[PDB]
Design a protein around this nucleic acid. Structure first.
Ligand code: ATP
Length: 538
RNA sequence: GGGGUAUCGCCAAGCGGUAAGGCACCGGUUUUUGAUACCGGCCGCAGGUUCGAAUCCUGCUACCCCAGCCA
C-alpha cells in the first residue's frame, strides 16, 4: 500500500525533518460517518500504525449550531467498529478554546487582526469576486487597544450575533479568496455540547484547525482537495503566532460512490425527511448503515486499500465495493438454505413425515463442520427454479426433467396445478430414493426448505438507493430515489436459522449473503437483510 | 483571477531506459451453488529537447474546487 503521501512521509523521515509520524482524523460532530470518512480513517490511522506512530481522533466542534452529542457518540462507535484506536484521549477542538482565544489576542497585539463591524451582507460585498479584488473595511485600521477592547466585548456578549466579528488582517486583493481577511471569530449565543454556555464567540475552521494540529504535535495534516486554497491560510496562521511546530497539510481527493450521495447535508436530509429508516438504514453509505447491511469492518478496510489515495477526482463503481464484501463473506460466511419466492412442491413417491440430511457449513471448507436438516415430501422451492418448458440453457427443474436437490435427492417433475389466475400453486414430482452419489447424467442443482419445520422469515432485498449514477449532480436528488431500493419478501428458511445472531452473515446458497436485522426481527418472524447477491450470469 | 487534475469502462503503479495490479466485462477448465477457485483476453491534444519521453519543455484543450459570520 503506497501513495504520494506515504512517499512524502518516507522522505521526511529520511531527511530527518521528522523522527515520528503523528496524524489525526478530525470529523465535525454534525452527522454520522460514511464510507468516505472510512477512506480518511484508513489513511490516517493506517499511516500511524505502519510507521509505528500516533493518530488522534479530534472532534472539530467549532460550530455549536450544527452539532450534537449524538454524533460524537456514534462517530466513536464507528471508528472503533472499523478496528482503529486513537492515541490517548478523544480530543476536541473545543479543548483549545482558551488557547485559540489567547492566539487571537496575540494576532491583535501584532496588528494582524481587528474587530470588523461590517454586516454579514457588507462583508460579502467588500470581499470582491473571483475576478474582481476586494476592498478594505472602514474598520480595518482600528488600533490594537481598540481591537482589544472590542474583542473582549464580543466575548462578554456585548454584541448581538453578526453585529461584529474578528478578522485576520491579510490582503483584500489576494487572488486567494480565503486570504481576503478571513473571519477568525464569530458570535453565536448557542449552547455548545462540550463547553455549554461558557462561550458566545466561536473560532472558525481555518483558525482552529492549524493551531489544534500544532498543539497536538501533528506532523502530517491530511484532508481533501477542497482545502488546498485553505492551506495558504493554514500556513499564514502558524507563521504569525508563537508556536513551536508547523505541521504541513497534504490534500487527497474525496471518495465518491456511484448511485449514492456522500454529502452529510444530503444524507441528513434523507433522514430528516424520513426517506430512510434512519442514519443506519441498510441502504445508506454510512458506516453504521453498511454494518446493518451486513458489511464487515474488514471488507471496508480492504476497499479503502484498493481505491488508493491520489489527487485525482473519482467516483468508484458499486461493483468495486461489492467485490470486497463478496470476497470476504465467500470465505467466512457459513452456508444455509432459504427460499425467497416459495412454491409448494410435493414428492408423491415419498412416504413418511421426514428425515434428517447432512449439510456442510461450507462446501469448500470442511473445517467449518456440518449440520442436520429436515427433509420431507413437502418442501418449498423458488418459483424461478421451475419451468414447464425451458431451453437447453436452463439447468433447473423442468416439467418433465430431473434435478439434484441441494445436499439431498434427485427429484423429477411430473405435473403441476394452477389456480384461478393460472399461477402454479403446487408442483408434484417423484424422487430417486437411491440418489446421494454420482448410471445417468444430471445437470443442475437447487436449494430448498422442507415445509415440515420451516421458519417463516421476512427477507429484505435492497438495491441502489438512487436510480442515477451521480444523484448529487441532479437538480433534486430526492426525486431521483430508486423506489425499489427495498423490496420486502416473505419466504421460508431452514429451522437452524432460528439461532442466527445479528452481526453474523450467512450465505443463502445460490441467492447471496444475508444477515439478521435486529431492528425488525422478532421471536416470531425473523428479518434478514440481503447484504449482496451472488455473481449471476448463466 | 487563483488553486488542482487528465495512464485500457471504474480505480491505480510509474518519478526519462522495452507501460504493474485490482474492479468490471468476455472466453476456457474444475465444481452436486450458473457461486468459488485456476488459466486466457483488455499514457488528454500538438509540437519540442533527447540515442531514448507517460516522465523534461512550450503551447493548447477538458474537468473539479474557491466569492459562508460552514467545514
Ligand atoms: N468523501 C470523503 N472521502 C475522503 N475523506 C473525506 C470525505 N469526506 C470527508 N472526508 C474527510 O474526513 C474528515 C472529516 O470530515 P468532516 O467530519 O468535516 O465531514 P465533512 O467535511 O462534512 O464531509 P462531507 O461533506 O462528506 O460530510 C476530513 O478530513 C474530511 O476532509
Amino acid at each position: 500500500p503506497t501513495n504520494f503521501i506515504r512517499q512524502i512521509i518516507d522522505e521526511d523521515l529520511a531527511s530527518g525533518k521528522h523522527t515520528t509520524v503523528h496524524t489525526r482524523f478530525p470529523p465535525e460532530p454534525n452527522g454520522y460517518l460514511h464510507i468516505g470518512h472510512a477512506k480518511s480513517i484508513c489513511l490516517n490511522f493506517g499511516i500511524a500504525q505502519d510507521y509505528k506512530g500516533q493518530c488522534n481522533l479530534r472532534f472539530d466542534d467549532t460550530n455549536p449550531v450544527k452539532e450534537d452529542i449524538e454524533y460524537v457518540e456514534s462517530i466513536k462507535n464507528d471508528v472503533e467498529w472499523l478496528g482503529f484506536h486513537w492515541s490517548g484521549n478523544v480530543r476536541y477542538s473545543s479543548d483549545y478554546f482558551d488557547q485559540l482565544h489567547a492566539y487571537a489576542i496575540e494576532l491583535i497585539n501584532k496588528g494582524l487582526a481587528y474587530v470588523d463591524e461590517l454586516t454579514p451582507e457588507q462583508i460579502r460585498e467588500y470581499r470582491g469576486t473571483l475576478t474582481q479584488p476586494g476592498k478594505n473595511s472602514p474598520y480595518r485600521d482600528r488600533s490594537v487597544e481598540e481591537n482589544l477592547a472590542l474583542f473582549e466585548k464580543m466575548r462578554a456578549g456585548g454584541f448581538e450575533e453578526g453585529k461584529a466579528c474578528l478578522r485576520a488582517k491579510i490582503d483584500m486583493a489576494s487572488p486567494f479568496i480565503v486570504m481576503r481577511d478571513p473571519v477568525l471569530y464569530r458570535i453565536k449565543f448557542a449552547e455548545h455540547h462540550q463547553t455549554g454556555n461558557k462561550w458566545c464567540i466561536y473560532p472558525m475552521y481555518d483558525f482552529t484547525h492549524c493551531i489544534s494540529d500544532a498543539l497536538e504535535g501533528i506532523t502530517h495534516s491530511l484532508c481533501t482537495l477542497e482545502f488546498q486554497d485553505n492551506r495558504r491560510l493554514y500556513d499564514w496562521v502558524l507563521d504569525n503566532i508563537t508556536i513551536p511546530v508547523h505541521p504541513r497539510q497534504y490534500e487527497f481527493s474525496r471518495l465518491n460512490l456511484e448511485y449514492t450521495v456522500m454529502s452529510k447535508r444530503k444524507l441528513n436530509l434523507l433522514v430528516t425527511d424520513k426517506h430512510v429508516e434512519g442514519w443506519d438504514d441498510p441502504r445508506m453509505p454510512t458506516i453504521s448503515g453498511l454494518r446493518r447491511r451486513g458489511y464487515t469492518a474488514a471488507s471496508i478496510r480492504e476497499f479503502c486499500k484498493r481505491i488508493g489515495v491520489t489527487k485525482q477526482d473519482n467516483t468508484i463503481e458499486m461493483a468495486s465495493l461489492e467485490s470486497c464484501i463478496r470476497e470476504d463473506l465467500n470465505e467466512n460466511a457459513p452456508r444455509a438454505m432459504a427460499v425467497i419466492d416459495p412454491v409448494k412442491l410435493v414428492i408423491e413417491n415419498y412416504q413418511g413425515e421426514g428425515e434428517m440430511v447432512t449439510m456442510p457449513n461450507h462446501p469448500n471448507k470442511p473445517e467449518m463442520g456440518s449440520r442436520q436438516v429436515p427433509f420431507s415430501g413437502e418442501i418449498w422451492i423458488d418459483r424461478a427454479d421451475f419451468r414447464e418448458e425451458a431451453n437447453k440453457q436452463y439447468k433447473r427443474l423442468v416439467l418433465g426433467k430431473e434435478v439434484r436437490l441441494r445436499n439431498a435427492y434427485v427429484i423429477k417433475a411430473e405435473r403441476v396445478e394452477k389456480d384461478a389466475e393460472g399461477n402454479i400453486t403446487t408442483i408434484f414430482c417423484t424422487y430417486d430414493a437411491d440418489t446421494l452419489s454420482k448410471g445417468r447424467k444430471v445437470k443442475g442443482v437447487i436449494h430448498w426448505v422442507s415445509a415440515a419445520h420451516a421458519l417463516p422469515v421476512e427477507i429484505r432485498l435492497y438495491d441502489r438507493l438512487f436510480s442515477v449514477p451521480n444523484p448529487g449532480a441532479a437538480d433534486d436528488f430526492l426525486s431521483v430515489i430508486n423506489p425499489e431500493s427495498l423490496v420486502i419478501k416473505q419466504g421460508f428458511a431452514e429451522p437452524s436459522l432460528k439461532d442466527a445472531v445479528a452481526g453474523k452473515a450467512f450465505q443463502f446458497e445460490r441467492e447471496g449473503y444475508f444477515c439478521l436485522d435486529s431492528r425488525h426481527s422478532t421471536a416470531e418472524k425473523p428479518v434478514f437483510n440481503r447484504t449482496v447477491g451472488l455473481r449471476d450470469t448463466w
